UniProtKB/Swiss-Prot annotation:
Signal peptide: none
Entry domain remark: All KH domains contribute binding to target mRNA. Domains KH3 and KH4 are the major RNA-binding modules, although KH1 and KH2 also contribute. The KH domains are also required for RNA-dependent homo- and heterooligomerization. The integrity of KH domains seems not to be required for localization to stress granules.
Tissue specificity comment: Expressed in oocytes, spermatogonia and spermatocytes (at protein level).
Location of the protein in the cell: Nucleus; Cytoplasm; Cytoplasm, P-body; Cytoplasm, Stress granule
Similarity comment: family membership: Belongs to the RRM IMP/VICKZ family.
Role description: RNA-binding factor that may recruit target transcripts to cytoplasmic protein-RNA complexes (mRNPs). This transcript 'caging' into mRNPs allows mRNA transport and transient storage. It also modulates the rate and location at which target transcripts encounter the translational apparatus and shields them from endonuclease attacks or microRNA-mediated degradation. Preferentially binds to N6-methyladenosine (m6A)-containing mRNAs and increases their stability. Binds to the 3'-UTR of CD44 mRNA and stabilizes it, hence promotes cell adhesion and invadopodia formation.
Name under which the protein is recorded: Insulin-like growth factor 2 mRNA-binding protein 3
Organism for this UniProt entry: Mus musculus (Mouse)
Residues covered by the RRM domain: 3-76, 82-157
Length: 160
RNA sequence: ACAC
């Protein structure tokens, strides 16, 4: 599943207790313990929705020991193959418009909506190949559509 | 330096 979070840009002395306080104060449930390394940690959310909520509400915003947090879907390096998530999609944008951008970098085998409580839309994309997803990520992360900057990232590709 |  897509419930595991990566938490990056952490203080030298950030520990599980701090992260437990951050999620409590942001009222984001977590499904298990926090595993703190050096500058980054991992934690599981009960479902994909809460994981996405944690990303939207904490990433780049939440400061901790003066350092702001990065929160992303945790994706093992080996599983960065064909699948992306695109966030901050203009709310009522027709899928023909989004798709016309996606096809410019490869064959899109699947394109699915992630229903979110923000105004913007979120979709999960599967391209034919690793090379195509990499290109689509390079050219679509940061692309300005209407007035929204698209946010593109890997999600686990567990079938390759 | 997304865990080794």
């Amino acid at each position: 599943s897509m419930n595991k979070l990566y938490i990056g840009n952490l203080s030298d002395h950030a520990g599980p207790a701090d992260l437990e306080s951050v999620f409590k104060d942001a009222k984001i449930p977590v499904a298990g313990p926090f595993l703190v390394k050096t500058g980054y940690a991992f934690v599981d959310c009960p479902d994909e929705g809460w994981a996405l909520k944690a990303i939207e509400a904490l990433s780049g915003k939440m400061e901790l020991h003066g350092k702001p947090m990065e929160v992303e879907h945790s994706v093992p390096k080996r599983q960065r193959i064909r699948k992306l998530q695109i966030r901050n999609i203009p709310p009522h944008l027709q899928w023909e418009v989004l798709d016309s951008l996606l096809v410019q970098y490869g064959v899109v085998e699947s394109c699915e909506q992630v229903n979110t409580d923000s105004e913007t839309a979120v979709v999960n994309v599967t391209y034919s190949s690793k090379d195509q997803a990499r290109q689509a990520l390079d050219k679509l992360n940061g692309f300005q559509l209407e007035n929204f900057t698209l946010k593109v990232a890997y999600i686990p590709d567990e079938t390759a």
